[PDB]
Design a protein around this ligand. Structure first.
Ligand SMILES: [Zn+2]
Ligand SMILES: [Zn+2]
Ligand SMILES: [Zn+2]
Lengths: 107, 266, 1451, 57, 101
DNA sequence: CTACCGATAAGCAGATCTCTCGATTGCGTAT
DNA sequence: ATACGCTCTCTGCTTATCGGTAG
RNA sequence: AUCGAGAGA
């Protein structure tokens, strides 16, 4: 995990994804002064493991593409360090049913 | 309608015996519901009823030009004085009797004389019923027009509502079964509905359905044409059920150079 | 559709493709050569006999007449290939960005290979692999690149093999919406990368550019002198169709590798090479004669427009062919070139002409113009939206509707005119000949009868022109054994008339919701030419009986009969899915009749009571459940028996409610208070007990469309049928009662007493001076000032000039005069009335809710009040007079539109004029609003038409994409959610509810322990926790709805339902114990679940569209447009709410608002004086500010900040504007140091200063060259002063402190910038800030915060207009919108990522989505409802969600 | 058969509208008695209609 | 040819078996949905109006939909509802197996 | 020192219930 | 005289020329 | 067939 106070030069961004399997994630001193998971609009996101993801797909007889999709670049996926292909779990505070469990896949 | 915007269609011709009759023996020829008044607030119709009854009794004509009365000299007061002088009641109420049972009603009914207009919006130019009739040429759907024996249109919003009921069979019967249902011919391999034809027969043979796209220029599997072009080719065609507008759309797309393959299931 | 001719085959799917020139030349019947249609058809012409039979001419292809000839296609041979208008843009894009020398793209070959590999991976469901291929950059020169490409190819092959082995994808590929989005993004980036190239990379050979001038014309430009310099080391013009075809053919046959994946979305089994000849039209296919028959209108014979365009193409083609022979003379013979040059220029002109003729035949916007083949399939009048998404139908009728209360509330009255024309195919049998033979004997004319008798072999004999004896003979031979073996499995049909047992579907346009089209029962009446409809359906259809008309569709098969009688029928739609409220009931006469019948004052003798009971209830019609009418003991025994109206209600319930069930126990209220019946009355409190009305009056709130009334309660406890029967019985009862005790209204109802009139006069005498007082308050003048004071008149003149001040004055005066109006009405109604309730029928209608309201009563009887126009008072002319009668600037309420007049006594001419203004405005607004919300419903429903409920209890789109895992979070049907939190009602009616639910038959098919145990564990954990915020809590237990199916496990309920049930059982301990009540409520929750196959998307779209018609931040339809129609990132009023800490005083909050809100430089400027002197053209721009102790207080801006902004930004912007205008016209030592610094920093500032001790002036001299012309130097200075900011925070326009509503203290800022408010944590609860802007919250908080914002906003539009829309609809809408992680919209932009293209092309821009679907060879499996109806297949939602199998008893 | 209105403005004579009788005078009872005329519909006496009331061509 | 059709048929039937869900593990509603009831009534009415053998005793009625409703009341409808899962899997519930309301 | 990617001013494509009646290309041209 | 050759609306996507950063 | 006027909810 890397942070930068003000800016990052564009040339230092073409080689971060060039060293697999390790990954580098870049954040800023700005946009991190407030944790965006403490916001009442933002539910609790739980990163689903491989076994639970397989159980979910078998339960719903789904395909990884058909699930609701969370972008790779929205703040929650950056916050969790989510990877493409791995499903997240959202506990929604529905005003008609209280707690409600829904899952989004990162693609 | 009266002269106050109180329009309304006529429901039933109520027989005079079943009509309510007043104490003087007169049955009204127009019955208007009292519930039409509170929302519109056409008090001019009440005032006209009062003045019409008073004028019919006294043999005079009552002028209804706006702004001839005021708060101090109310038309209700004026026409009530005239009615009371004539012997009827001040408020225009007449004690009436039920025409079906005969007993006097709970309260005095408000009667009077108002001027009524008959509008040209008659039901004899509105009703229309279709069972079959003239269909269109290209879509083979019912034509448009009341005088043409034409059907009515179940449109986009009607289709969307018919889906919302979950009645997919209602949708089928409306948009396909009763509009442009056809048992066309489709080529199994080509997947095309238009490039098929009814082959001409020989002496004793029976006409069959063949295809032109999957056929090449030339004993048992030889089928001829009307123009003499006999050749062996597509002998594997089925019959599916489609709208005819689908066939017209296929022809139009073929005019654009676009092909649609129809994958027949079995 | 005959059901006696089954169809075996079925269209599984349709895939778009390109019609090549070879197959059309193979399939065609004949070629069309001469452009002459008729002399009789021209042999070789457009109407040739090989293209179909034509006017008794047997077709020369199949030898059949016009009836049995399907029509065959022909082709016209184009002499040269032509640019297909559909694909011209792709042709042009591929022509550009290519090397004419090496015949490869000007992009790096390795990059092209990378794109090809990524596309090959995306052809399968391998998005992750196609992104892990990017990190194989070498790595790990030509040999290195070849090895890298081999590595990438082997990686792709291994990934695809692994996916195929492990099951994630089959050999056909996995194409979904997200893989489609990825493929489209990749192809778009590939094309953009191609077109942004200057020099070829495989061989650095510069290629000439190209230019575009519409269509049919492509030209290339020559390289420059410096560009050919590289062309001198590497060693305008009109290009031809054949030249560009050869170029692109070479390029495509070289780059097949990448093209097989660019022009494909799924793998191609046949491996057919993608060829460039598919982009050119060298052959045109002509539609058959059947589809190009002449448009003949009597003697008005017209040629078909397609024939016109084809003939023009033929003329140009023959002209080119002839030009190709004489040009041969000037080439074989050694002739001069001038004539040859003329012939060649003519040939080029003819090429352009034939290209334009082809473009005209295909399209009409590229060639008043004749509509081509593209315009026939384009818009609302196009083929799709007018002949596939809406059609004309047989077996339907239309007429004017008239009321009828003597018909069942679930029935329709059909005249004999319809009843003899409409007919139904009833196949004869051994159990049906009793009535069908009778109908055949009756014939087409005597209802009920048979118009036609369909034989076994499909022959349709007609009985219209037939005699009675022949009809009897046919009916005797109607049921006969089949003599032919090939037709021994069929029975004759009878097209009998529409009886009383048949079912019919009604509809009244506009069909804003599904309730506006129901399936009624047929009742054949004896009078003609009007459709009879009960009064219960008026609310459902929004119908009326002042000329309204509605359609009557007659289903023709027992499947549609069952669908209409069970699913679409009238009594199963008692409750609207929009909010679960009832929509059926009685309206006006029945409501007033019930108010009069169910009072204490009503008594009935034995004969009267029995007559009313038998009038309403009729056992011989099935209205009674006991086969014998049962009555009650009279409420009075001596002196003589007397019943009561409430006893009539009790007897009605006693006879229609089924026996062996307890009576209804309901406690409710009505609309009429207890002060309208006298002192000590309790008739406002309705009270039922064992089905006996013991107190209160029946009102609009009980029978009608009202929740928790007696009819709604009867519905809940006894099913829909009993509520329908109760509505019918009450309709008959209140009709027969109103006949004998008729209801009336008159002049005496509208009169006040002498005391009432004196009260009204006394109060209205205080309205003379309210306008003057309000004007004095608005103009900041002390009270008791005369109405004609000169200063007051001047201020009123200023207010008249200024629109905002005019609005302020209107608001203040309107408030005061409305207070006076309220005083008058509350004083004079009902105390001052002459005739009083219940005798006063006007007030009876107002209070009872039958018609009108207290507003209408007050307008009739007290006064009309202020006339409001466009939210203001009456308009005022430029002279200050609002009317010629009133003197200028008349400070009087009557002048401004305050009508102190009533419709009982009449209004003056001026008030009449003002009231006409108001009425005209109202009529205009209603006319606009009737269809201002028509586009929204279709925009929603096009995308949501497939979203349904699956058997997994997860709602998901038609293709299979999952939208939500559980409908609303709890899978509760909205139409069944009504009596779930009504725990007191359920406890009171426990025994009847138990009887209706029957847990005796609901035990062996349920698991009743595991769900309960898990729910107990989860509740215990939640009770232990939940004193901590939502992010910090660890879940450790998903809600029970996640694990256990709510429709299979008893006790699996939502967290809110369980909490409410436990709170009820804990707060009231009341003979049935809590255990059985809890079990019953959980079973009710199980039985209140939304069925699999529900069209939840359609329902949500309709329930958010239809209520919209009922309609400083945008509201209503504009806001619904911003949110759900286009999803604008820049909304008209972007706001974000800022919660405050409870330790911050309101003074501190206001100071924070001032210090955060922006302040321009122009907001501290008093005046600017520009002393221009040319004695070298100078300016002395003196700036005058307000007093410091004024502007610092107002804006928190001080002398130092003012000097800083002037020195840095204002002077800079002034110099920039001055120099731009100049260029346009061509075509104390500290103060000294500051002045010198500013002079040096800026261009032509000569002097500078500032009031450093008072901040009152800023005078700086400016100078310019003498050669410059004259400048305004006031307009530009004013614009700069407007532009320059003193203190602003980006995107924030103004922060204000509204009054604390809902208790919480919040601030609202104009403009959204989340990361800028995170820094003010000392004043703002930074974790609670929410915004209007969905895009901003999506960007800085994530998809789910955007989902919450969408739901809250799309709910805030309805909830401001007091409209209730269930959150399940809004949640479904928002989860369909953010289904890709982005704030998509409901339009064609957001529609592009979709599996089915039939849906998009039916929506709009049909040509574009057709080209996209044919380039990618898209194959849609006919999943969306639009595709099903385009191909005519049974829909998937609803009753098509499954299949029906027959259990034959033999293997 | 049209009739001059009993209730008419003074401008009815000035424009000579008697030459063009628009409608007819009728005895109208404001009564809720039939139940067939609730929303906006109205009830016409059958006997009056059988005596040429409101007839037109 | 014949062998190509044989392998096509084998692949089709194998896919069918791989999609079917056995009776011992179906997780759908035990009840009969309103759509299922309506379509089963309509289809049974079609069948009986097409001269099918009937099991219940006719009470003089002649409406095929009414006869189908009588059969559904007597649980004598020989039909099977094939509830389709989103991915093509199907559970074959029987009319008698389901509980009507 | 020039290639490539943003970034605002300009250009370009598009939808917003039923039913009557009335009207319908201008010249030119060679016999 | 006649037949026949022909000037007073709303959005949102897409294109063009000026800004830099970097090998 | 197209564009103009009007009408009903
Ligand atoms: Zn074929
Ligand atoms: Zn033919
Ligand atoms: Zn090259």
């Amino acid at each position: 995990i890397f942070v930068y106070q003000n800016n990052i030069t564009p040339s230092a961004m073409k080689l971060v994804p060039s060293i697999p399997p390790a990954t580098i994630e870049t954040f800023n001193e700005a946009a991190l002064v407030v944790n965006i998971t403490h916001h009442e609009l933002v539910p609790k996101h739980i990163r689903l493991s491989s076994d639970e993801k397989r159980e979910l797909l078998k339960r719903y007889r789904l395909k990884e593409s058909q699930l609701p999709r969370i972008q790779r670049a929205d703040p929650v996926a950056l916050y969790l360090g989510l990877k493409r292909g791995e499903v997240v779990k959202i506990i929604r505070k529905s005003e008609t049913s209280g707690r409600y469990a829904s899952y989004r896949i990162c693609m | 309608s009266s002269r106050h915007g109180q329009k309304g269609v006529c429901s039933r011709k109520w027989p005079t015996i079943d009509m309510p009759f007043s104490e003087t023996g007169i049955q009204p020829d127009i019955i208007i519901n009292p519930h039409a008044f509170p929302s519109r607030m056409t008090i001019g119709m009440f005032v006209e009823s009062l003045a019409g009854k008073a004028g019919a009794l006294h043999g005079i004509a009552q002028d209804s030009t706006p702004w001839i009365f005021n708060e101090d000299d109310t038309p209700a007061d004026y026409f009530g004085e005239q009615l009371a002088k004539a012997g009827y009641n001040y408020h225009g109420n007449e004690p009436m009797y039920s025409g079906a049972t005969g007993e006097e009603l709970r309260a005095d009914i408000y009667v009077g004389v108002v001027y009524y207009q008959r509008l040209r919006h008659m039901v004899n130019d509105k009703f229309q019923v279709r069972s079959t009739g003239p269909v269109n040429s290209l879509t083979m759907q019912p034509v448009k027009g009341r005088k043409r024996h034409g059907g009515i249109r179940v449109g986009e919003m009607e289709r969307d509502a018919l889906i919302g009921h979950g009645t997919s069979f209602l949708l089928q019967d409306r948009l396909l079964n009763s509009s442009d249902y056809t048992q066309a011919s489709v080529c199994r391999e080509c997947g095309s509905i238009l490039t098929t034809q009814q082959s001409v027969p020989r002496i004793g043979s029976i006409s069959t359905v063949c295809c032109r796209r999957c056929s090449m220029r030339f004993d048992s599997q030889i089928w001829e044409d009307g123009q003499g072009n006999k050749f062996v080719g597509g002998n594997e065609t089925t019959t599916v059920a489609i709208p005819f507008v689908l066939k017209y759309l296929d022809s139009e797309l073929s005019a654009m150079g676009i092909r649609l393959r129809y994958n027949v299931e079995p | 559709m005959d059901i006696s001719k089954p169809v075996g085959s079925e269209i599984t799917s349709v895939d778009f493709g390109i019609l090549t020139a070879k197959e059309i030349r193979n399939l065609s019947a004949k070629q069309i050569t001469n452009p002459t249609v008729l002399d009789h058809p021209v042999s070789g012409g457009l109407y040739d006999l090989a293209l179909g039979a034509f006017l008794r001419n047997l077709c020369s292809t199949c030898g059949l007449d016009e009836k049995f000839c399907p029509g065959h296609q022909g082709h016209i041979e184009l002499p040269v290939p032509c640019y297909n208008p559909l694909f011209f843009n792709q042709l042009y894009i591929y022509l550009r960005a290519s090397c004419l020398f090496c015949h490869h793209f000007r992009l790096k070959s390795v990059e092209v290979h990378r794109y090809a590999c990524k596309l090959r991976l995306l052809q399968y469901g391998l998005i992750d692999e196609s992104y892990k291929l990017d990190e194989i950059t070498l790595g790990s020169s030509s040999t290195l690149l070849n090895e890298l490409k081999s590595k990438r190819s082997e990686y792709v092959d291994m990934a695809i093999a692994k996916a195929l082995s492990d099951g994630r994808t089959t050999e056909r590929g996995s194409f979904t919406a997200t893989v489609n989005d990825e493929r489209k993004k990749l192809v778009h980036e590939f094309h953009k990368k191609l077109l942004s190239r200057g020099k070829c990379d495989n061989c650095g050979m510069f290629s000439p550019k190209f230019r575009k001038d519409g269509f049919t014309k492509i030209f290339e430009t020559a390289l420059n002198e410096k560009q050919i310099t590289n062309n001198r080391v590497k060693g305008s013009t009109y290009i031809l169709s054949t030249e560009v075809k050869n170029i692109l053919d070479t390029v495509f046959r070289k780059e097949q590798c990448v093209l097989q994946y660019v022009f494909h979305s799924r793998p191609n089994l046949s491996r057919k090479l993608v060829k460039a000849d598919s982009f050119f039209m060298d052959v045109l296919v002509v539609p058959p004669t059947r589809f190009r028959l002449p448009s003949k209108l009597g003697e008005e014979v017209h040629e078909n427009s397609q024939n016109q365009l084809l003939s023009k193409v033929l003329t140009t083609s023959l002209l080119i062919r002839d030009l190709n022979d004489d040009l041969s003379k000037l080439q074989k013979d050694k002739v001069s070139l001038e004539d040859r040059r003329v012939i060649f220029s003519r040939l080029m002109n003819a090429f352009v002409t034939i290209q334009n003729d082809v473009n005209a035949f295909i399209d009409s916007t590229k060639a008043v113009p004749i509509p081509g083949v593209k315009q026939a399939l384009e818009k609302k009048e196009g083929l799709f939206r007018k002949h596939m998404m809406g059609k004309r139908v047989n077996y339907a009728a239309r007429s004017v509707i008239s009321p009828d209360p003597n018909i069942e509330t679930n029935e329709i009255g059909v005249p004999p005119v319809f009843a003899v024309k409409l007919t139904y195919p009833e196949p004869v049998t051994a159990y049906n000949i009793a009535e069908l033979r009778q109908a055949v004997i009756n014939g087409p004319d005597k209802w009920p009868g048979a118009t036609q008798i369909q034989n076994e072999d499909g022959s349709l004999v007609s009985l219209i022109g037939m005699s009675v004896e022949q009809r009897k003979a046919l009916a005797n031979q109607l049921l006969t054994p089949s003599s032919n073996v090939s037709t021994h499995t069929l029975n004759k049909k009878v097209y009998r008339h529409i009886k009383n047992r048949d079912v019919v579907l009604m509809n009244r346009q506009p069909t804003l919701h599904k309730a506006s089209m129901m399936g009624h029962k047929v009742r054949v009446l004896p009078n003609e030419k009007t459709l009879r409809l009960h009064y219960a359906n008026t609310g459902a259809y929004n119908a009326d009986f002042d000329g309204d008309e509605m359609n009557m569709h007659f289903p023709q098969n027992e499947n549609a009969r069952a669908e209409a009688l069970n699913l679409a029928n009238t009594d199963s739609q008692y409750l609207t899915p929009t909010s679960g409220s009832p929509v059926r009931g009685l309206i006006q006469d029945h409501i007033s009749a019930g108010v009069w019948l169910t009072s204490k004052d009503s008594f009935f003798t034995r004969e009267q009571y029995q007559q009313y009971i038998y009038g309403c209830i009729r056992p011989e019609d099935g209205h009674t459940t006991r086969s014998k009418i049962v009555t009650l003991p009279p409420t009075i025994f001596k002196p003589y028996p007397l019943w009561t109206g409430k006893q009539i209600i009790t007897t009605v319930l006693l006879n229609v409610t089924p026996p062996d069930m307890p009576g209804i126990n309901l406690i409710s209220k009505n609309k009429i208070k207890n002060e309208y019946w006298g002192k000590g009355s309790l008739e406002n409190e309705v009270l039922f007990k064992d089905g006996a009305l013991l107190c209160g009056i029946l009102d609009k709130s009980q029978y009608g469309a009202s929740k928790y009334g007696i009819v709604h309660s009867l519905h809940e406890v006894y099913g829909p049928e009993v509520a329908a029967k109760v509505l019918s019985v009450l309709g008959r009862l209140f009709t027969n009662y109103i006949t004998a005790t008729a209801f009336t209204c008159g002049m005496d109802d509208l009169r006040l007493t002498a005391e009432g009139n004196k009260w009204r006069t006394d109060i209205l005498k205080t309205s003379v001076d309210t306008g003057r007082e309000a004007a004095a308050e608005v103009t900041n003048l002390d009270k008791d000032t005369p109405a004609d004071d000169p200063e007051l008149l001047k201020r009123l003149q200023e207010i008249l000039r200024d629109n905002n001040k005019s609005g302020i004055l209107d608001a203040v005066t309107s408030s005061k005069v409305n207070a006076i109006t309220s005083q008058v009405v509350s004083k004079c109604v009902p105390d001052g009335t002459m005739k009083k309730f219940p005798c006063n029928s006007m007030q009876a209608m107002a209070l009872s809710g039958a018609k009108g309201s207290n507003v209408n009563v007050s307008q009739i009887m007290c006064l009309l009040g202020q006339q409001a126009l466009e939210g203001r008072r009456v308009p005022v002319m430029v002279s200050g007079k609002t009317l010629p009668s009133f003197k200028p600037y008349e400070t009087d309420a009557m002048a401004g539109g305050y009508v102190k007049g009533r419709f009982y006594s009449g209004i003056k001419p001026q008030e009449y004029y003002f009231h006409c203004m108001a009425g005209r405005e109202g009529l205009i607004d209603t006319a606009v609003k009737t269809s201002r919300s028509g586009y929204l419903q279709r925009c929603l429903t096009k995308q949501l038409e497939g979203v349904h409920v699956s058997y997994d209890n997860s709602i998901r789109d038609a293709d299979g994409t999952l939208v939500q895992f559980m409908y609303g979070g709890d899978a509760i049907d909205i139409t069944k959610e009504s009596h779930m939190t009504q725990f007191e009602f359920c406890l009171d009616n426990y025994y009847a509810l138990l009887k209706k639910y029957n847990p005796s038959a609901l035990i062996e098919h349920l698991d009743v322990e595991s769900a309960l145990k898990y729910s107990k564990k989860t509740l215990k954990y939640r009770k232990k926790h939940s004193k901590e915020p939502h992010y910090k809590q660890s879940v450790k237990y998903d809600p029970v709805l996640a694990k256990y199916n709510p429709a299979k496990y008893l006790g699996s309920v939502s967290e809110n339902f369980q909490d409410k049930l436990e709170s009820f059982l804990d707060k009231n301990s009341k003979g049935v114990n809590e255990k059985k009540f809890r079990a019953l409520m959980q079973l009710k929750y199980m039985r209140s679940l939304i069925n699999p196959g529900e069209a939840v998307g359609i329902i949500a779209s309709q329930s958010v569209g239809e209520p919209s018609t009922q309609m400083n931040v945008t509201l209503g339809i504009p806001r619904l447009r911003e949110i759900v129609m286009t999803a604008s990132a820049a909304i008209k009023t972007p706001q974000m709410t800022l919660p405050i800490w409870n330790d911050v005083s309101d003074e501190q909050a206001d100071t924070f608002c001032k210090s955060i809100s922006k302040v321009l430089l122009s907001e501290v400027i008093d005046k600017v004086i520009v002393t221009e002197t040319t004695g070298a053209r100078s300016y002395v721009i003196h700036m005058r500010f307000f007093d410091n102790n004024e502007y610092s207080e107002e804006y928190d801006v001080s002398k130092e900040e003012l000097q800083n902004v002037i020195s840095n930004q204002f002077i800079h912007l002034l110099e920039a504007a001055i120099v731009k205008e100049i260029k346009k016209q061509k075509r104390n030592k500290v103060q000294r140091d500051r002045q010198s610094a500013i002079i040096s920093h800026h261009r032509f500032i000569t002097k500078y200063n500032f009031d450093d001790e008072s901040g009152k002036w800023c005078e700086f001299k400016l100078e310019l060259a003498a050669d410059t012309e004259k400048l305004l130097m006031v307009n530009i200075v004013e614009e700069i002063c407007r532009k320059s900011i003193i203190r602003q925070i980006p995107h924030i326009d103004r922060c204000v402190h509204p009054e604390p509503e809902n208790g919480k203290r919040v601030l609202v800022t104009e403009g959204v910038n989340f990361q800028a408010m995170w820094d003010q944590e000392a004043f703002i609860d930074v974790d609670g800030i929410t915004s209007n802007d969905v895009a901003a919250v999506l960007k800085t908080y994530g998809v789910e915060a955007a989902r919450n914002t969408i739901v809250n906003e799309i709910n805030n539009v309805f909830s401001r207009y007091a409209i209730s829309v269930s959150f399940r609809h809004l949640d479904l809408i928002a989860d369909m919108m953010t289904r890709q992680g982005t704030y998509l919209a409901f339009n064609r932009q957001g529609m592009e990522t979709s599996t089915s293209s039939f849906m998009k092309m039916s929506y709009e821009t049909t040509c574009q989505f057709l080209t996209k679907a044919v380039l990618d060879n898209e194959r849609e499996q006919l999943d969306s409802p639009s595709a099903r109806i385009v191909v005519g297949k049974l829909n998937n939602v609803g009753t098509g969600s499954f299949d029906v199998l027959a259990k034959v008893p033999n293997a | 058969t049209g009739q001059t209105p009993i209730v008419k403005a003074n401008l009815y004579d000035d424009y000579g509208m008697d030459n063009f009788p628009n409608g007819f005078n009728a005895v109208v009872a404001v009564i809720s008695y039939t139940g067939y005329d609730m929303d906006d519909a109205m009830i016409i006496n059958k006997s009056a209609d059988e005596r040429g009331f409101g007839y037109g061509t | 040819g014949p062998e190509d059709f044989q392998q096509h048929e084998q692949i089709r039937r194998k896919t069918l078996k791989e999609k079917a869900i056995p009776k011992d593990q179906r997780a759908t509603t035990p009840y009969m949905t309103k759509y299922e009831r309506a379509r089963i009534l309509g289809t049974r009415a079609l069948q009986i109006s097409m001269n099918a053998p009937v099991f219940v005793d006719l009470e003089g009625e002649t409406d095929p939909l009414r006869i189908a409703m009588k059969e559904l009341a007597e649980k004598k409808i020989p039909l099977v509802i094939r509830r389709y899962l989103p991915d093509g899997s199907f559970e074959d519930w029987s009319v008698e197996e389901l509980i009507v309301d």
